[PDB]
Symmetry: C4
Subunit: 220 residues, 4 copies
């Protein structure tokens, strides 16, 4: 609590400081969208690559100062931890990790924190169902890998291939025309595997949303 | 408030006046559906093109009188502003803009105003989530444009192409058979991009509707 | 109220009488499923065609007696009117109309009447939205028929073709891969027509179900 | 209630006993996922096949002891009956039935029993609607088998083929591009069969979920 610590603390905790970050984030948002254009990279190529280094410097500077002012409390703050790693991740597909910077606009702007927290608060109630769901996939991914993986390697050769395909069946994306009707050319009873799979997986997802609705009706 | 202003005001505010517009709208609705038929345009070609000019005249006449009688209040009335521009838009793909006329049937008929207002009143609560949603698309549209846009220009070459495709993935339309399974031929880990994208985008849309339901349960 | 009228009335209003109809219906249900088999039609061909005449006789007999016993009240009873026409429709694709007989199993069995009435009672509240919905399709079916019907006759040549396709887009069935991406080969801005169409049509359907839920929460 | 019965009863009813089963189940879960790998079966082939015999022995031992300790009450316990048959089914596509073992992890772990019971408790209320639903499919499966089964055997030749296709149409999977648009090449009015089919089947599923939500709002 010296005159040195309170100097930085009054800057960091200032409203300008935050507005500066938000203003940066948004610019770097824009400029990363322009870096898409080969037209514009061909011209203003150097102007952007430094600007991304400048902003990560500023963000590192910023993320250091936030640590000083908060020390251990900073590492008990999701949004800081997020801002931490996202800036770290962007320091170290190399160029890709960068754009995660822009996710800070959620951390920085507090109407987003609000919304994001609303959505995340729903996830804890679901884990019980997600657990049953993921066990169910695991059991069925195994069955399908050995039932069909032989004559149908592309879709069910590995365990992970049956995982992907089964998740595809869950989304109902081409499940019949693209998968189960071809499987039936060889294994005419595969419909006994997949229609029950659809029913179960569907019913669960339905109930899940009913639960989400009713869990957020116990509060009203 | 002269004897001239009250003359028109008693006509405009009359019930016949409105019934006349509604009756027109519906006819012009019908006749624009017949203008679809090359058979019927080949015969009654002239009969319709003037009829659309007649009706826009009447609608301009009408939309003028509504302004006199209401002056500035007319430009603080959505439904008037809508009726205004829709008739203006139809005055100035040229022939297309016309058919927007028919949208007045919503403005004119008050059981539609009712329904339309019910739906629009939900939109303000959503913007917070839509904002987070559109930021999320923007970030991912950028990643996919550089991750895949090279070997896959048709789907991810521009930023807007990744936008369209990502919205397609959101609708789950052919997302696996049509997009992610082909991408995996080249980039075998693309599933790490798209399954999380689906989960997030899905979960949000789910919560959005839960919110819509619960926001309209705080009123009951 | 003679000794003749009360004779039939005590038979018609009996529990056996109803059990007999239900028992018939179910048999004719079964036998119509067997008439699917060319194998079984090749053998027991005559046995079934008379059995369907027998049952419609019995149903006509039955539907006459119900009229005697109830006279005008019979034509103020949906379920009778339904039973009426379904038996009439089956008297007069000829063979198809028959199978509608089986829909009486809903009329006859009262746990179905219950469920069916629960579902129908929801329809009156929706008409307002359905009206706005069908107007919206009509307006857009017109626009698409003239925007695209030329270079794309199969999907948008008539008005009804644009209706079908637009309903297909609503179901999100192949809307992008199958329709809007091909349209974009020629008309690169068609996405400005169809994404807004999807948004509107989607949002409405969402709200519709929210309304259905909340309209059946004003009762609790 | 001898000193012999209480010996086993105190073992079976112990917490270790259950932890041992759960620990086994999870291992056998893991090892059955590795038996997917031809790589790993080529090496550790014998190690796994006995391990599955060992575990079913233990599970048979276990499932015997549970019967002693509970006698007739064991056959009035779903979870036991389930554990019973799943172990029996795994004793007697031969190798497939095995993996059903892993479903015991639901029976064993009581946070799963909880979730599973929550979902099953919803099914009794639905049967009334499911009954109407399955009758409806039956009636329409019959109509489509005779309307289209001739020129379109692959999709509607048998009754079961029309069942599968109609369930596919219900899922909206390729219903137009893949089925109804081809049917329309020959039978141009098939849209009169399938759009109403979609509407009905959709509306019902919607209401079903509304019911599920409201039936679980009578408890709050
Ligand atoms: C955290 C950050 C928040 C700030 C968000 C900032 C939003 C604005 C970003 C703007 C980025 C614009 C990028 C852009 O235009 O890229 C170029 C591409 C394709 O152009 P290009 O490749 O040059 O084509 C050249 C063709 N030639 C040679 C014949 C002339 O152009 C296109 O393909 C069009 C791209 C349209 C992009 C629409 C962006 C919507 C952003 C919504 C953000 C919401 C945030 C809450
Ligand atoms: C679009 C997706 C964007 C993802 C951004 C992730 C940001 C993480 C933020 C976070 O976890 O917060 C959720 C909750 C809420 O904490 P809480 O302090 O109640 O929020 C206060 C909100 N306020 C300011 C309006 C009063 O915090 C907690 O309750 C604790 C959370 C622990 C960490 C969990 C992080 C999960 C998401 C991170 C995504 C990682 C991808 C692998
Ligand atoms: C409620 C929702 C339940 C969701 C169940 C799981 C859905 C995701 C399954 C999935 O997409 O797995 C794909 C991976 C990749 O397999 P892999 O064999 O590496 O690649 C397949 C495609 N290939 C060969 C052409 C490259 O497959 C694997 O290798 C296994 C993936 C991990 C198992 C599933 C983990 C999901 C846990 C639930 C996460 C919920 C977070 C809230
Ligand atoms: C409750 C749901 C109903 C369960 C009823 C289970 C009955 C099992 C009936 C098995 C029928 C059958 O023949 O299975 C074999 C078929 C076709 O194999 P096959 O005809 O031998 O293939 C010939 C081709 N070749 C030469 C390359 C071998 O291959 C298959 O398609 C076998 C499919 C069996 C699926 C069983 C999984 C049901 C999971 C239900 C989970 C509910 C929650 C616990
Ligand atoms: C704001 C306005 C409200 C008023 C709404 C008025 C509704 C009624 C509009 C009727 C428009 C009829 C248009 C029409 O039939 O167009 C022609 C087409 C195709 O015929 P065409 O091209 O002549 O084929 C000739 C073939 N040939 C040479 C071999 C004979 O025929 C078809 O393809 C059949 C088109 C069926 C259209 C169904 C319209 C439903 C309208 C629902 C409106 C609800 C409003 C709340
Ligand atoms: C909650 C829902 C969230 C929705 C996220 C956005 C979904 C829409 C994205 C979309 O379809 O964008 C398409 C445009 C057109 O790109 P463009 O490169 O012009 O054309 C692509 C196709 N091509 C080359 C063959 C002609 O892409 C662009 O050029 C960028 C479009 C603007 C960015 C997204 C704006 C949506 C804001 C949310 C609106 C909600 C209103 C309530
Ligand atoms: C939480 C979700 C999990 C996140 C885990 C991230 C782990 C990243 C692992 C990267 C794996 C990898 O090898 O990436 C490269 C692959 C394939 O590239 P590569 O094999 O080099 O392509 C060879 C072809 N050639 C010659 C033309 C270059 O290309 C890809 O497919 C890269 C895909 C990376 C997706 C990462 C984005 C995750 C977004 C999660 C957002 C959550 C909310 C904040
Ligand atoms: C209002 C009425 C209520 C009463 C409902 C009665 C339900 C039972 C109806 C049974 C109908 C059975 C029809 C049937 O099996 O048709 C034959 C077909 C195909 O056989 P087929 O064409 O003879 O194949 C010959 C092949 N060959 C020469 C090599 C031997 O066989 C198949 O393709 C199998 C068909 C399976 C049908 C499943 C029916 C489920 C009915 C659920 C009803 C619920 C009502 C609430
Ligand atoms: C809320 C849901 C809103 C639903 C909007 C309407 C959806 C149905 C539209 C539809 O499928 O229309 C198809 C017909 C047939 O057109 P048509 O040109 O005869 O045949 C097209 C295919 N072809 C040439 C290869 C034979 O198209 C027409 O000819 C016009 C059909 C009548 C107009 C739409 C009437 C639907 C009113 C809403 C019914 C709700 C009942 C509760
Ligand atoms: C709010 C939603 C945004 C509305 C914004 C409207 C802006 C209109 C911009 C028009 C763009 C344009 O160039 O339109 C023409 C394009 C392509 O035609 P074009 O390039 O001439 O085709 C060349 C081929 N050839 C030689 C055979 C003629 O053809 C098209 O793709 C035109 C598509 C126009 C769709 C406008 C309808 C918006 C409906 C919104 C309804 C909301 C509720 C009232
Ligand atoms: C009731 C039981 C509860 C216990 C659950 C235990 C969960 C862990 C199970 C692990 C199983 C691993 C199986 C595995 O890796 O299989 C091998 C495959 C493909 O490898 P492989 O076929 O050897 O490829 C050789 C290629 N070569 C020759 C060029 C080297 O590898 C793959 O394709 C990757 C497979 C990823 C599987 C992801 C599993 C997620 C399980 C989630 C369980 C949740 C339970 C609540
Ligand atoms: C609410 C949801 C309503 C669901 C309605 C029924 C949906 C399932 C219909 C279905 O997938 O049936 C397929 C079977 C197999 O027919 P089959 O002719 O053996 O094989 C067709 C394909 N092939 C020739 C290439 C091998 O078709 C048949 O053989 C008849 C199947 C039995 C009739 C439908 C029984 C479903 C009852 C509802 C179960 C709900 C449990 C809670
Ligand atoms: C309420 C819903 C509206 C119901 C209106 C019913 C009107 C029936 C109109 C029949 C039209 C018609 O021409 O049907 C025949 C068509 C095409 O057959 P066709 O043109 O003879 O085929 C020529 C090919 N060849 C040489 C191989 C024979 O084949 C078909 O596509 C006939 C389709 C008839 C479907 C009727 C079923 C409606 C079920 C509604 C259930 C509601 C809940 C009870």
């Amino acid at each position: 609590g010296s005159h040195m610590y309170l100097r930085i603390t009054n800057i960091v905790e200032s409203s300008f400081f935050t507005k500066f970050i938000i203003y940066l984030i948004v610019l770097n948002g824009i400029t990363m969208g322009l870096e898409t254009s080969k037209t514009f990279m061909q011209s203003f190529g150097v102007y952007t690559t430094l600007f991304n280094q400048i902003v990560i410097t500023i963000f590192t500077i910023e993320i250091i100062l936030r640590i000083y002012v908060h020390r251990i409390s900073f590492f008990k703050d999701p949004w800081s931890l997020f801002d931490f790693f996202v800036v770290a991740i962007s320091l170290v597909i190399r160029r890709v990790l960068r754009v995660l910077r822009l996710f800070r606009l959620v951390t920085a702007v507090p109407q987003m924190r609000k919304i994001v927290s609303a959505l995340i608060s729903v996830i804890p109630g679901m884990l019980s169902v997600i657990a049953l769901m993921t066990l169910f996939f695991y059991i069925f991914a195994i069955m399908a890998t050995q039932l069909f993986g032989e004559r149908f390697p592309e879709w069910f050769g590995t365990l992970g291939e049956s995982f992907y395909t089964l998740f595809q069946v869950m989304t109902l994306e081409s499940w019949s025309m693209g998968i189960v009707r071809p499987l039936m050319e060889v294994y005419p009873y595969a419909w006994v595997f997949f229609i029950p799979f659809i029913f179960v997986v569907t019913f669960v997802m339905i109930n899940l949303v009913v639960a989400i609705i009713v869990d957020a009706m116990a509060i009203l």
